[PDB]
Amino acid sequence: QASPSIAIFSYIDVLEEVHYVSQLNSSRFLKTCKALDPNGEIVIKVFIKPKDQYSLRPFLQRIRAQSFKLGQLPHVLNYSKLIETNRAGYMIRQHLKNNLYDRLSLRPYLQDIELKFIAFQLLNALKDIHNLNIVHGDIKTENILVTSWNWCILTDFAAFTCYLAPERFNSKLYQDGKSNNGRLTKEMDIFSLGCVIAEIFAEGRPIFNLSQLFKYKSNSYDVNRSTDLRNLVLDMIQLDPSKRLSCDELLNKYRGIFFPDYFYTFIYDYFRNLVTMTNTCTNSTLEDNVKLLDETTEKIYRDFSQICHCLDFPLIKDGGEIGSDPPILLVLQQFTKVSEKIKSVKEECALLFISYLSHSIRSIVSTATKLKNLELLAVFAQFVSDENKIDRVVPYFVCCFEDSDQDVQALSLLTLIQVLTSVRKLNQLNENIFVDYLLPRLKRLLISNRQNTNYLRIVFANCLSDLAIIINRFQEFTFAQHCNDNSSTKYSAKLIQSVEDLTVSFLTDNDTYVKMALLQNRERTNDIILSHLITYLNDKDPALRVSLIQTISGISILLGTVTLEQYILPLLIQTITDSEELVVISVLQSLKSLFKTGLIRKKYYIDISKTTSPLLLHPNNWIRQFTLMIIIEIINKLSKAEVYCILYPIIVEFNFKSMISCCKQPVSRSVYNLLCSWSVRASKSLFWKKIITNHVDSFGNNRIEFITKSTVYSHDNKEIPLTAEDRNWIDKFHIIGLTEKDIWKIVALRGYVIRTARVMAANPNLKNVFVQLEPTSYHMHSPNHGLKDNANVKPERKVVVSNSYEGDVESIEKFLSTFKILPPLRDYKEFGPIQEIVRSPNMGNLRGKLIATLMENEPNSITSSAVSPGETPYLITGSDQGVIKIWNLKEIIVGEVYSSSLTYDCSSTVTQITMIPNFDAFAVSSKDGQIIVLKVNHYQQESEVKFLNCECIRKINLKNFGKNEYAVRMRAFVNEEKSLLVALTNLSRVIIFDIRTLERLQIIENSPRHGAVSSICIDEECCVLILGTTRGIIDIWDIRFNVLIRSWSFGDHAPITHVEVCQFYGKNSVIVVGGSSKTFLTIWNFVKGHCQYAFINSDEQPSMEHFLPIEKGLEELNFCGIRSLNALSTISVSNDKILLTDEATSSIVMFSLNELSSSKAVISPSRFSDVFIPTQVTANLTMLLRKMKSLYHHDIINSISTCEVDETPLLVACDNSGLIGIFQ
Amino acid sequence: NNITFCVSQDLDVPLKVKIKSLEGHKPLLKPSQKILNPELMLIGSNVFPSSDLIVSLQVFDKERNRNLTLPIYTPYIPFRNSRTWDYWLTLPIRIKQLTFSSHLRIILWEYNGSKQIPFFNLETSIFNLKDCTLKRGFESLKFRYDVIDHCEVVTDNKDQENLNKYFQGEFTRLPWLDEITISKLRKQRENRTWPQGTFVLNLEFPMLELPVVFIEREIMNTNDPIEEKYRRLERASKNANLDKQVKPDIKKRDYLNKIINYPPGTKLTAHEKGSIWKYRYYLMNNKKALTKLLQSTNLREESERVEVLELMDSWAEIDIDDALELLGSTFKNLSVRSYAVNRLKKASDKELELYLLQLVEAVCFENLSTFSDKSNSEFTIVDAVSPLAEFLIRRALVNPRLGSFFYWYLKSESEDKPYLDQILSSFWSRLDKKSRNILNDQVRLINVLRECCETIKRLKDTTAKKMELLVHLLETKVRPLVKVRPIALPLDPDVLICDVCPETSKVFKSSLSPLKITFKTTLNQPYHLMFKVGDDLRQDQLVVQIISLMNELLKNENVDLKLTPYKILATGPQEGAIEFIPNDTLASILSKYHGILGYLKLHYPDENATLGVQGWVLDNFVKSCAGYCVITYILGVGDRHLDNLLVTPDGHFFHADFGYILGQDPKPFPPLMKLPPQIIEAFGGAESSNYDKFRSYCFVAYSILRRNAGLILNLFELMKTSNIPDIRIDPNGAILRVRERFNLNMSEEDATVHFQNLINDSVNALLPIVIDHLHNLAQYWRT
């Protein structure tokens, strides 16, 4: 390309599609049509060349008028793009390709009485609005108004061979160009042109001619073609300016008082259509979107819009379900019918707007299009002969149209059902052969993609076979209508006869398709044959179909015998001649006794159905003679089938004796007494099922020997001899009562039947038992199906994902907004920064001499002691007086300054405290029921560190529980996943509050049989809580399933001091101080259910039976503790070293988990120390022994904490006397 | 199993539900049978049947109260065992098919007594308000006679058990304790309640993953109406029921006949097609109404095809000129191609001139050829390698010259379509006589000759050096010409070539490096020939053939425009040959001769004793000028300049470089006439005579052309349908443009007079506007 913006064609000044038509006139200069296309999508434009237009280019006013006119989007057509470039000054408009008159000739079917009046009304409204816009004078031609799938008329400013519509004023007043007069025009000229155009639209041919203009000059015209319409038209026709056309006055002179309001609501709906009707101008997908949206909104508004004009209570919609709710809102599609075309149109209802919305519904932008087309099929409710034909014609087209979704067939079947609900006599003689061909078209469309289910459509069409017979009756109605004339009754009779003979072939094709669908195997079609058998009354043809269904019943008796049951139950509805086949049906019942229990119930249904209407007495007498004997089964349905024997006996004395022969009821009198008889006939079929198992076992055994000591009885004789010793012991394994003495010879026939059931399979001490049934999988196969779906590979995300595209997925996005979030965001949000974990090697080897003694508060002991880890550890201890104290590690190490570096007033007694993992925050709970966490604030200066201020980050009252409970013990934890805290109530109730939202996540309660909570501990995964019991029990609970996992006990069964999860022992083992007296610490593996290592203070080894785990014991145990001073103590374990404070000798002890041998006491007495060493009595259990052999003065230790100075390790301790000390 | 969110269309298959447990009301036998009681005298009075509870499942649709899903029912065990199944069941509606609007429903049908079995009813929702289908998870429900539903408390605990299935963060020891939670779910059996008129059921439908649901997608493609809808309505109006066919006649028959007289390529309307459908009588009567009526109906089903094909042999034989309309690829009908082949069974000398379009037909001859190819491969699977097509084969085997023409035509199509290469061998097998095959090999040596010319074009040297080298090559080629026997001539199939004169040959100075050699024929006369290589001459060749055909159409009018039909053809894919002519450059004739008068007076000077007039030389020159003008207007040949135009001393006006045509010009699009300012002056001084005469010949050629233009239009339709150089999807618009320049829609010939007025404006501008004068100056500058 040498230059841009150019074009290949001569007249074409810019990039566009190929050439097109054009026109010219003696009235105005020639013009040419043009098309600009986006690779196969074009609009309707007009050719104008800006290159040669630079000489004048007075397009200003025209562009203003174009902007003003096309700016609004009324019923009239609006220009797309009016513009001038450096090359092409061509104009543009939306694609139409339909002129008003040309479409009037092209669409005789779309043309209707009220339709033309509607379009003319729209044109009148548009013209009146234009007259209200203070702009007019556009030349009126038949090519101005365009039509779309919406079947609406849209007029454009450019109406461009055809007969022109002259303005009488501009004509008669024209002399030498009206003395060189400029552009002039009036609304009157538009009124006259609009008049002539309206007449041209009415008749189909215009009045424009030279002789017509001359006649207009002659002030006379011959009127030939309604009164008011003719007058209103003649007003504008006679003299435009002089006779005062007054378009507005005519708009107020509109005849219909109803039609005006209906077309007002349809004008609002036309505004909706305008919303649907709405370089870069407009998006391509915006059209489809506007379409689907227009449709959905069309229905959603069609509820109330229907309610407006000529509605009905019952309908298929939601609001229609509310309307049908008043009128009593198996499975069939039904609604308010037409009722003889709205009772011959008592309300005079004729509307083509529904057909217009259907023709607009012909397109499809989503699956909402299904409900759209369905709504159109509902709009078909208005009954019109010619209209119903096209409406029904559209439905089959829609059927054969979309093979994408299977829903198309369903919607098509729905619209077809509506067409069957039309219920109108044939207007045209074509309706017969057209229906005959309609069936063939549906047959051609019946062949389609595999795996799709046409069964429902088959049952529907088969149910519509009666409607087909009604269509034949409609052909007879056409014959009767054609017989109304003279010498045309016999002709119409012969025509109907020949058409019936030709219809026989159509019926043959239908029966052929029916037999085809029935032979298809897709068992859903067989169930679809039920409705076929129900509506089969229209078909009087031979039993051949029933024979095909019989062979189908045999092939079903092969494989699908469960479905064979349901089919046979429905097959009892045959109700046809040749009762000789009913005997074969009875044999088919004997064949139905084979395996399926559902077949037994079905045969019972057929038994009652046959009990209603009989055929032959004697045959059914012997039949029922065997069947009633076989009816003694204890099955729930077998009793029901047994009850039919009395009803059979109703239809006398000889039969009474003959029945009394086999009668099992001595006291039987009548029907009620027969009910008492059946009540006395109560038996158990469980032992009968086991007996059947013994029969199958006998079938697996050797029947070869016929020795002892074929007729009907020979089977029984061969059945009894089959076993001797085995069947005897089997008979001794049952109840073996006098009521169990019943032989039940029918169980032999059912035995051969079950032998056929076993003949459907392979050959049927002792080996593995043989089950009578097998379970479906449905589990792993579902996951594998998820792997196939993974081969399909839809999307998903665990973490946050980007915003999805707009659509129905907005519910899934709102679902993503329906899940609580930002658990992790609460971690970095507030309460300062987050430190890291710094560890140290084993500290147990050091001497551990005490280098410091400091007590801030003499008065009371500290209820809690904790330390904030790091390079410079922050010491913290509470108070019984409700005081919070904080001291600096390094400052106490070097300068040895001894005071509170920080002091916080709780104003009330504090319960406990813990430092939040990997954080600078310190959490604390107080017996006032006050739970709060204080964030740390510190600074670093002069090569050192200092503390600033202590303030509580969050405040949550534990008094808000309502029972006023005080917090017992508190343990908090932060997982990278999420962070939270857990605490024990005053009633010892486990409550886990979310650290993020400061709210309670869940509440757990230990059983009152366990007394109170003896300790608190958290699992490694923190999905489980480990808590001791004051009853001297150990309880681990899973918070995942929110239940108690296990409850353990051991030793002397006394109270448990403490419980915790050791490091080296892992989560599979827990360390618990408590239980047996002599034992200091009992470590037991949770899963193992045994105590691996028990550290005990004593001079001898304990008892093995006493040390064994206690399980079988119950809550009945009375609590027995110890008041000795050696009971209460404190322990802290970390880094493979477990430290325990011994209150016995009042000394600090340290047990190294690596070697209990090398383990020893940090601080001890003056005279001598203790020597300790372990051993193992049991393979699964070991035990450590401690053999015993004074300036420092301190009370019992209420708290202890292990710490590292980043130089050398060390321990801190707070006693019950309110004194603290440190040992390095 | 894995949880993940997967939308409707995204999700694949149909739903299934496993159902297990219930809640015993304890008011009757545990199967809910008969309503047990000590008052049972009344139970005999009320005839209370003992019912064994079974179940059935079907889904209420959308809450739109329609019916969609399938009822389904299972077998019978004790419902006094409370019928604990966990039994799966399903139906045939996918999740992609499943409308997010939908609801489950269930009916528990027991088995009671004579014609008696009970019935209980319930309903629920399919997916979540969060769109997850029952969260793809386990549940429990409760239902009464009507207006009752399900809740979650202990079912909320069970839903947490489904959160164990829903994959909340989990571990291996947690799994063992989830076996301990199988012990816990075993402990969950402790539940108790004693309601009435309502019941509970435990039903788990845990899936792997959380569904999601939406509508189905769709496709918008090619605020508008469409083509297929009009097809729908029109086809709905196509009933034609009562089969009796009347044979009425009226004055409207003439108008209908006029309606059937329209051009072949036109697309008829609805009412016109039906009017032509009821015109079958007269349609059979008129031979020109055949093809039009054939296109007036669409054959898809065998119903229409029945009467159609039945009337195919019944109707009068159509004119062979109008037979080219139904011989296109537009109609692929078997009976159509058959009957046309039967009509084309007669092969005249004009068939040899129709061979160019027959090559196009050969390119379009393949439709669903897989079956035919497999049929040939079936017989080709035996021995190792080492339809109108039968009519073309018979015509090829008949005359050796026609066979040579078919082979030469196949040589060009061999490059574009690979099947043509083997089709040439099939053509050699189509001709039994090998007599033509020998001369075909002798003419196949011409490929090696063209390869030798390309070898001479491979080396780059001086102009004179390449000339002498071309002379030596002409001598070496002269040796082979005498060595090899006589062959078929490129100019005509009848004439045979003997040898070539080495010193009489010439060389083109152009960039294409064409070769000009005078070869003495078997008639003992020198024949100049100009050949070229490394380019596709198919454009100018087909244009030359079209010029010859049009010349025949003019000869049919018993009037000659004295236009020289220069012979042009394509030897190889890149190679082509053409008959040379005494052509001189326009710029050379302008500069050297100083006007066309002296150049025309060079060969045959004519000075009359009166007006100094010139004879049939100048007459033929003028006729050639007007004829070339008409051709340039009609065909719309572009890229025609002073260089592209040549002058033939024989009195003819030569025009070359037809590569750009059908409205395609190198510069901005000019007018139709190719007449320059020089010829406009030469005919301008003589205008009083010459312009009137040239206008007479103009109008005459217009009438003659437009009369028979239909056949040429159909032939051009098929030819363009095959394929084209310099044009691709041009073709539709090209056909259209041919019709517009032809102005077939206008019965007025005044268009030619308008073109004459334009020619009158060519000498002097009308100056309607400044831009108009600038446009005339632009056309003058372009020339």
Numbering used by the authors:
A (entry chain B): 10 to 169, 194 to 258, 267 to 319, 327 to 377, 402 to 559, 570 to 603, 613 to 742, 750 to 807, ...
B (entry chain C): 4 to 225, 274 to 437, 479 to 875
Copy text verbatim from the article accompanying this structure deposition.
The minimal Vps34 complex is a heterodimer of Vps34 with Vps15, a putative protein kinase. This Vps34-Vps15 complex is the core for 2 larger, heterotetrameric assemblies known as complexes I and II. In addition to the Vps34-Vps15 core, complex I includes an accessory pair of proteins, Vps30/Atg6 (BECN1 in mammals) and Atg14 (ATG14 in mammals).
We determined a 28-Å resolution structure of the isolated Vps15-Vps34 heterodimer, which suggests that the structure of this heterodimeric core is similar to what is observed in complex II that does not bind Atg38. The low-resolution EM structure of the yeast Vps15-Vps34 subcomplex shows that the 2 components formed a stable core, and this assembly may also exist in mammalian cells.
